[PDB]
């Protein structure tokens, strides 16, 4: 695939750096992943080939732009 784990590591590091607490951002990521999984499970099929946690990391890093 075009998405390697190195990019996810850099994105996670960037998410950690631009915040005041690591525990708070961990909780936010967990909440977003749960919401995304529930949305997937009740409608359509979506690009299921990515875990919800990775999806949440990707959207949260893209929102930084």
């Amino acid at each position: 695939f075009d998405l390697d784990s190195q990019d996810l590591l850099f994105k996670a590091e960037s998410l950690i750096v631009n915040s005041t607490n690591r525990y708070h951002v961990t909780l936010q990521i967990a909440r977003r992943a749960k919401q995304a999984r529930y949305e997937e499970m009740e409608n359509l099929s979506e690009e299921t080939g990515i875990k919800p946690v990775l999806r949440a990391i990707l959207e949260m890093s893209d929102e930084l732009n």
């Binding site: 590591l9 850099f10 590091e13 750096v17």
Partner: protein, 47 residues
Amino acid sequence: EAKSAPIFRNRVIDKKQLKKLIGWTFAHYGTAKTAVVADDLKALGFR
């Protein structure tokens, strides 16, 4: 994550110099570049 160029170390490299380099890399670039730098150094030393 950028804007700092490495110095040319024209000397013999023992463990202390490697530790100094690792500390410098962590202090200037972050925790994601240090892993790749350590991996590259390990591969070169093994080779």
